[PDB]
Symmetry: D3
Subunit: 118 residues, 6 copies
């Protein structure tokens, strides 16, 4: 078994609407978000790879454009943009064009994140 | 499933008591230790998260104050303070208060660590 | 000569109001900003330090709290919140309470920043 | 169960022979490679570890010396030196001298790599 | 005084011609090179910046393309491609187009590097 | 002007003898300490360098061996081993064997350090 992964970062704004009154996350703020796409599958004997890294980047690119330098709450499905909802949403957007996807990781900060799978 | 993780670092001294005579780990020394706490669970449809990262941080804290800026060998159960032993010890202290705990990782140095699960 | 520094991270939203329209920075977005404060001065023979790292952390606190998990455009003096303007703005808030401040570095992203001095 | 891991970096050149003529990986180039060896086993009740980190390092050394500061295409088995092939290859060199080995990870760049377990 | 900086990484092979016979840098190998371009200048009142990060990026591009996924020794002026020689050579390419340039840093590996300032 | 730099890390214990009664630094503890040595001089036309990175690693080794996996307080001159004192102390050990030394930086934690320059 072989797993490949590629990391991306994007700069965005968000706010959490269902947190308690005066919770710091309920104010408009932002992060440099780290996402990791992980894919599992067979290695081709000839090319020596599961899929070209550049090909994983290209598949993620339209989702990436929509996230980077944007305000996440304005994206349908992200109206509650926690790390967990974000990772599921990314899975849902990318799984159909990367059928070998087996994990998506979202880090909001250098110290805290989330991993979504199947 | 969805996993959450939060990272902490604490600064401590320790010594390994059972290593051979010349061994550098037998001398009083210290490290910047890194701990990752991992938990696995259901995402609440309303809050959009498993628990607040800050809840996690708050639960580890009593344990954190005991490790940070201390000499590990003086803590009961850490009298042989390897990473393997520390990881299990941290699991035993934190699992009772975070039942969703699914792994603890401890890194002594930037290049070396271990993961205790179940 | 001896210089000390301490690093801080805060999560915030901002947008640049004087970019041509269509410029990515003109949209509401965010970053995990890193700030480095740098002081220069005489080491006390008794304490062995210039001042305590925690004293530096404490003098920065009221400024830190205005920036962390906030929208920077709403802070007066920050209506054009570029890295350059922000480093100056922080200098200006922090120099009165830390007279040995010799530099302020602001990093918007992991790959890009600014340093302000004197 | 408990898992131990150890990280190494080696500096190397390589080119991919089976990419289309345009492709940038077909040019002679290089990377600071990162490799992680992962072992899973029983923690000895006296030593308090699975095996010494230093032992894992000493076992990887001969493989390490072949990789470091070398051109990978000249190494038998690495004539198509992708991340995937490197992972499996390292697995193959290392599993016989470290039977606890449970994963090998190779990172070609900071944001991209691959995990192998047989 | 304000300084701004921007980091880039590129993947390249090289080798050193003037080291003694068994020296490891004399073998064909590679690295993930890191370069930091630094500029110093006045902050414009309207833009709030010295120049856009993206402008510094665009000026460096023709030079960056020559370096990434290439063999350094084949580039004229880089037949002895040490960090020191690389740093000066980048300065020499970029300085004429970016007169505000005040420093070029190169790092071959995570822990070693060089800074050229004219 | 050209400057070259090399980073090292060592694992050590210390405590601060001159902090008030309850100060956490006054307890026995430890750090992964990072040290950067910086040197400044002329690049030899033939070697393409100031000195070999490995040469600087060799000049620092006897001093490095005294710090790594050791209790700093028992080293003469380090009875009060703050970052400031340690950076001056390392300068003092390293200057006589590296006349081109222009800076020593010491970092105790990931986010706080000291730079001493003569
Ligand atoms: C910035 C941070 O306060 C906010 O983004 C936040 C706070 N707590 C959180 N907690 C969880 N579990 N998930 C999150 O995304 C999350 N997010
Ligand atoms: C500093 C380091 O030598 C010492 O803490 C050390 C050395 N070797 C080790 N080896 C293992 N397996 N686990 C450890 O915690 C460990 N720990
Ligand atoms: C998001 C980022 O592109 C935007 O914040 C941005 C773009 N270019 C920039 N350029 C400079 N010089 N300073 C900035 O703060 C800056 N900031
Ligand atoms: C340099 C880099 O472009 C080249 O080494 C490259 C490109 N795409 C890749 N894609 C995969 N899947 N694996 C690789 O090792 C890989 N390797
Ligand atoms: C990779 C490394 O072994 C080799 O490239 C190397 C070794 N020692 C060096 N020493 C100096 N000063 N500069 C270098 O670029 C340098 N470069
Ligand atoms: C571990 C940390 O609490 C302790 O070593 C500490 C605390 N505050 C400090 N403050 C200064 N200025 N220098 C130090 O070395 C220092 N060192
Ligand atoms: Zn947030
Ligand atoms: Zn140790
Ligand atoms: Zn921005
Ligand atoms: Zn490559
Ligand atoms: Zn090299
Ligand atoms: Zn300390």
């Amino acid at each position: 078994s072989t797993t490949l992964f590629k990391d991306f970062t994007f700069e965005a704004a968000h706010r959490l609407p269902h947190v308690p009154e005066g919770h710091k996350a309920g104010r408009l703020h932002g992060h440099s978000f780290m996402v990791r796409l992980e894919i599992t599958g067979e290695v081709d004997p000839h090319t020596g790879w599961i899929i070209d890294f550049a090909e994983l980047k290209a598949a993620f690119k339209p989702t990436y454009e929509r996230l980077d330098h944007h305000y996440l709450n304005d994206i349908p499905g992200l109206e509650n943009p926690t790390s967990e909802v974000l990772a599921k949403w990314i899975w849902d957007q990318v799984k159909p064009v990367v059928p070998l996807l087996s994990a998506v990781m979202v880090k909001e900060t250098c110290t805290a994140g989330c991993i979504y799978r199947g």
